[PDB]
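Task: sequence in, structure out. Protein: Thermolysin.
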Amino acid sequence: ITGTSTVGVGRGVLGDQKNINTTYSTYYYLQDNTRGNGIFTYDAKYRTTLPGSLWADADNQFFASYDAPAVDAHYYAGVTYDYYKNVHNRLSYDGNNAAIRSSVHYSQGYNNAFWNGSQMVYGDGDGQTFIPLSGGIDVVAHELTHAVTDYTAGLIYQNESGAINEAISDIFGTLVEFYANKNPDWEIGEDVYTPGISGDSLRSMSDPAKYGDPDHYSKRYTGTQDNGGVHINSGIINKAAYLISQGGTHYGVSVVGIGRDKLGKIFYRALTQYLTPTSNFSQLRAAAVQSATDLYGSTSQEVASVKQAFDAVGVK
Ligand SMILES: [Ca+2]
Ligand SMILES: [Ca+2]
Ligand SMILES: [Ca+2]
Ligand SMILES: [Ca+2]
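Result:
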């Protein structure tokens, strides 16, 4: 909407106070004009019609329980925008400052969040498996990264290309979590998953097998569930990315770690310059090797570490 840029204040899903960019015109709206062509957050009102209504508030104060998922979806979209712009010189998900739209309160007790090809959508969770999913910065950044993938590599959401798609979202979700630097880790969803169980998460990149996901190509799922295992076989790529960044010895294969920033550069270049809609794991390995070669040189430690990591997870 047309109005003047304002700064509201509120509380997120985890009870933390933060400032949020709003727009004033009769009401204060969750419309941040400071980033690109805007970040807009909508109320789906427990229904599944999207996007719902642009979030309107009478006083620019967002401390009600009902406001919390909207506060975090809006704020963490801004953090994700900043990561892509500041770290990768990418202006929004399309590279041309497309408006970023998110809807919260989607459906009733909905235990998921997703990018739908046009916008981000967050369930509130059922209070047992999840609390409102926008409370996790890694979740928000994971889902917005699907939009980046849509506009670049276009990895088909099935089988190995789909597992790469998922892993790319887990990788950048985690790198955004480190960028914001609040309790960062290599786990996925830990801030909003199972409020009654401490210390767990939905997936682990450092040890995917902790939650039953494969950490080696020889353990890949080949069935048809989960679009051919896109959230299962992502563990193989998540483990390779973790090893590239942090190093370690995995199934007897040693990997020299090169750090998160270089991991992000290598995988962002692979995603935007080399991967295609049908890329498989072997082609991802070649894309990452070429990306590291472009950035650091063929004789670099970075190239050698990429090769070691894919070796360690059984991807040739
Ligand atoms: Ca208010
Ligand atoms: Ca964390
Ligand atoms: Ca995390
Ligand atoms: Ca938990």
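The pocket of calcium ion (ligand 2) is lined by residues 177, 183-185, 190-191 (CB under 6 Å).
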